[PDB]
Symmetry: D2
Subunit: 387 residues, 4 copies
């Protein structure tokens, strides 16, 4: 390193930053780094990790997570590759293996400081910069519905034109570790406000004749910054709180559900990530009584519109019907579906990759999520025209 002082190997793992999470058991020799997934701040759920490793330029690092099989979704470690970045801007997949007990990342950093994460993060700064720009567009407003447990705003983005229209609600990231959900919203909003390569596209403009959009890009700001996977700062699973939200335990859902009730709703989408399945898929309310025949017709029609909007989207693989028959209407899409009788779907993207259309370098990532978001506006235009 040219200065006697820097010479030798001095590995340091740190994680005190937005979404950081790791427990370090041991970090002396680069081929013997021992870690544990830290887990959510007030819940036994554990899966999300995000940390910085410095001092390992050119050293082969073998990083073992000891409690991998004790995590929320151990199947999520099969055919999974961790993501890394030298600068927090560009993320790539690294060699990773799982033996049924432990996850091992085997990677040689090319520079002095590298970050590893379960998926491409999406920070509070990015969120605040994005909404702070989006609000300046003539068709956009940002409304603060309330505060999270730790005093972060619950922000609603309203996009539409002056006058009634169908009210389309899209909420994202109830599970704070599913950062793909906020990437997805970013892509969808960019297209709605006409930025970049969406500048001359007329879909948004047509949509505004039929609909107004009510979008929450981040349902769980506290859980995000805390580096949780599935819960808010109070330990609540926001997507089990739709029947009895609480001012102290789940204010995030309290204030949003109050808004949907006070405004109305004609199409609803809850954007999520799935740890296990390497596919993009949707889940509706067909496996529930009270599901009308015209609802089957619309839902079916929309699934076809979405297949036509994006090849990434598919309907062959997904979860079995009684996956959450027990939790019933505690889930957002099930609840909204029932209260409003409209098309109501959960959209789920992979932490691994789209096995149909894989990419060795990036797997599923922010850019692909953002493209899927932009593509879905096409499916909504079809749907709204057809009904």
């Amino acid at each position: 390193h040219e200065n006697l002082y820097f010479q030798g190997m001095t590995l340091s793992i740190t994680s005190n930053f937005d979404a950081g999470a790791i427990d370090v058991v041991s970090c002396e020799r680069a081929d013997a780094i021992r870690l544990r997934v830290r887990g959510d701040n007030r819940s036994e759920f554990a899966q999300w990790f995000y940390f910085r490793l410095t001092g390992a330029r050119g050293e082969r690092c073998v990083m073992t997570f000891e409690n991998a099989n004790d995590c929320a979704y151990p199947a999520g470690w099969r055919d999974y590759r961790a993501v890394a970045s030298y600068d927090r801007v560009n993320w790539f997949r690294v060699p990773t293996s799982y033996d049924g007990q432990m996850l091992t990342i085997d990677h040689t950093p090319e520079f002095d400081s590298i970050h590893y994460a379960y998926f491409e993060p999406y920070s509070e700064e990015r969120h605040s910069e994005f909404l702070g720009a989006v609000q300046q567009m003539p068709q956009a407003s940002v409304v603060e519905l309330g505060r999270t447990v730790e005093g972060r705003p619950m922000s609603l983005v309203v996009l539409g034109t002056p006058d009634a229209k169908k009210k389309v609600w899209i909420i994202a990231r109830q599970h704070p570790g599913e950062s793909m959900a906020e990437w997805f919203i970013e892509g969808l909003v960019k297209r709605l406000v006409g930025w970049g390569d969406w500048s001359g596209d007329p879909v948004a403009r047509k949509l505004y004749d039929h609909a107004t959009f009510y979008i929450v890009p981040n349902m769980n700001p506290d859980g995000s910054v805390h580096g949780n996977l599935r819960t808010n700062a109070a330990g609540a699973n926001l997507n089990r709180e739709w029947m009895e939200p609480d001012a102290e335990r789940s204010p995030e859902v309290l204030v949003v559900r109050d808004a949907i009730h006070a405004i109305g709703c004609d199409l609803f989408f809850d954007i999520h990530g799935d740890e296990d399945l390497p596919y993009v898929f949707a889940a509706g309310s067909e496996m529930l009584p009270g599901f009308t025949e015209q609802q089957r017709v619309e839902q079916s029609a929309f699934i076809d519109s979405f297949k036509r909007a994006s090849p990434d989207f598919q309907d062959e693989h997904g979860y079995p019907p009684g996956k959450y028959r027990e939790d019933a209407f505690k889930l957002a899409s099930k609840y909204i579906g029932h209260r409003f009788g409209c098309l109501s779907l959960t959209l789920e993207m992979p932490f691994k990759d789209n096995a149909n259309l894989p990419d060795e370098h990036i797997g599923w990532n922010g850019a692909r999520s953002a493209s899927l978001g932009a593509a879905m506006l096409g499916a909504i235009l079809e749907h709204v025209r057809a009904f």
Copy 2:
């Protein structure tokens, strides 16, 4: 202006640059500028203009084109607005009127130098920079098929992946003044190579399983730089040369038609602009004998796919069937259709605006053309799946 020397008004109109064209009758007083459309270099056709005006900062300029009603398409001046730019990068529409004899631009430039043009230009530098970047993508090659009358290359962009697939041909700008055609290709290619907001989109990638693309972004390089509307440097209308192309008069079509013959063709698109109609529309070969029933079926199916890909596209307005029954197979799409029996269409975009979805600031422009190009890939994916 602070220096006695610059004081006073000194108006100058110049046009010696790529695509420049104007005749100046008089240019002393800003409210009395008299012009003529110069017309094509070896043909009576006249419509395209492009010139720089300096020295008019803050002066109201009334610019009258005396021969407007003697141009190729005088209907093109009705409900038409000229485009302007202070920097050749950003173009906007300016106040323009037509009394059935003369076109008048009435505009007050905000800066010392402004350009006026019939439509947002697309230069040889832009073309050479674009193809020079596109060629570096792993799925792209650029092939020089031959030379134009004045020694400019006829460049083919080939996009696809390793192996048979459907051969899709898209040619643009046979009429050099229809710069929208090359904007359209730029948008289509950007999406095929995954640039910008197309980075995570899987449509291109799916398309490459079914097709390889053979694209000519500029069929008439000489006519472009010359500031012609409709003819090449030799006076030839390239879109009347498909039956007997000639090495001296129409080499541009000679070399391209030889390539289509030597490679084969399964879908063909000829991208154009229409001076009169304020709509985006397609014309096929249905009004011709030898047009099979399975051809009607495919063409109809594709028109529906394109309406679904872009709201700008429509099928209500267009030209009557016998618009060119006389010229028959001299036109590219008619010829290709007949030689290959495939889907073969002319796509036409407006010099005015899309009357269905107007925009006071820009009318139809490069960005909107580029978006339509990118959107059409969606329609091709549908089509190729369906047949």
Copy 3:
């Protein structure tokens, strides 16, 4: 706002984000917002503020800070204007007054969400992205010297070329609220690694023949994120810790001072901000015994080189000699000067503006600090040549 639900005025002030700090006394009516500077997390020092205000689009906001005269530097409120930003990217000054007791911001936000701050912030994300890019340059390494009280890295950026050379040390932001110090380093480093408009400049390259740079862009990471002005997370004033740094109270200075001792030092700069003076100025060790005549000569020579490098820099205004004769060698530049007998200076930039070269729109800001940083490399090249 078009939806009965959003109608009315609902003001919310929030501050749970990197560098956020405010106490809200009252926030019901926009013309009656009452605030207090929150003050440092474990120290009586108080001056820094940073908060988000939403719901005030188009409302005149009169925001009064009740304890302004109880802050660390009440003179800092005279001729001072707060900074604001709709997006955290672009910052501008807003109308502000001070009556000797209270500070009042009188501003009408143009959008739904705006942030107000004492000075243009510089976040942990920006820092991590910047160093994560800089490390990839061939002349740069990043070394983690240790951890702050709360486990954030103390990062050293080493810039130079292969071989002895003069060792130049530049440290910034010992007082975490002086974000201008890290802006200054950003500009200096960009030029050293040849980014942007520094790409073809040969100064860096010449410098590397004479010197190697040892730079700490952020001496107080914990204090920064905490929204402190003057102290770290433990309540320590880092610039009083240079005689007896402590592993528990002031590790930031412990590890950096150990590095300077282990590496050596031939020029030292401590980058700071001054709340009161609207001037850019330097302070050296001339008012101390043990200050040699060749030291007076070099320091004088360097001050002249810096005036010649940047008009913003001046030597007329500054602080009187015995400003800190009491604290002696507890201050970094005084200590280094004495231990190494080299040129050692504190450089100070204004929170207000450069009264010599004011700018109504921005006052002193990040861009101006970054330019001063880049300009100072010129002065170092002169100095190093002359001695």
Copy 4:
């Protein structure tokens, strides 16, 4: 290439574009390409070349210029490397040799289309886009002084603030092949208008208290587009026309010299390139009678200020005094010096490299020229303060 049609090798050299120039003797086999420098359109001077080669991806190209020793400056081929670019945006040096008779480029293009040139070009489009943006800045105006032989504008950029001040004149590219001169002006102007990394820099602003700038970025627009080295479209060497400029033969100098006479002048710079010397250097009027002692003093003082502004600049190497004692006052700087008695210099940059500070990848290029231009403002601020 996957299609029988593209298979085989088909090399094509073309040059019908802005600044293009080459004669092709033979171009069948890639290792046997035979060329000639085409030479200026109406003058025996020959050196500039610029052409596109397609069809050579992955082929080793040996390109021999047969008349290299018959060119204007055969010494210019010693230790010289040609420049290349796949996209006209990024230029790099390629392997080149000279045996005293012929120049040989030995290079293997990595893509299907590559351009080779004597130096990084600077096009009419770049010029028109640049001035079209610069004019919008509050301190800038663009004035069209007249027309070149072929009707291109002679454009003056005036930069300053409202009121007397010293009038500083800087003219560039009298010899159209010396594209470095216009790169140099681009860098100088960007800094004067505060773009990019010059945004927070106060030098421009200080300068505007002392001076107003009168800048001609391109003295020879016709010669540029024609791909000439040394003459305009009429065959005139503009830098021999300062004593008797002519409306038909050298209007470019007629109109500019009239402006300098009508406005006045207190510092003059003529920006050029030198084919032979691999150094940056200045030439003044000291070797001429009528050169006062206070002129020696100022010129000497300014040379020192420029060495201090940029390491690239030097005064050791240059041309001998009687290099143009014969042509006397036909040269711009000699003439202006004599008419106005002010500091008047020719600044000369290399076509090869700066032998003091070489760069294998780029040699001397646009970015380095632009940096030197920006750096020289520093020297002018010193000078203007000192006198």
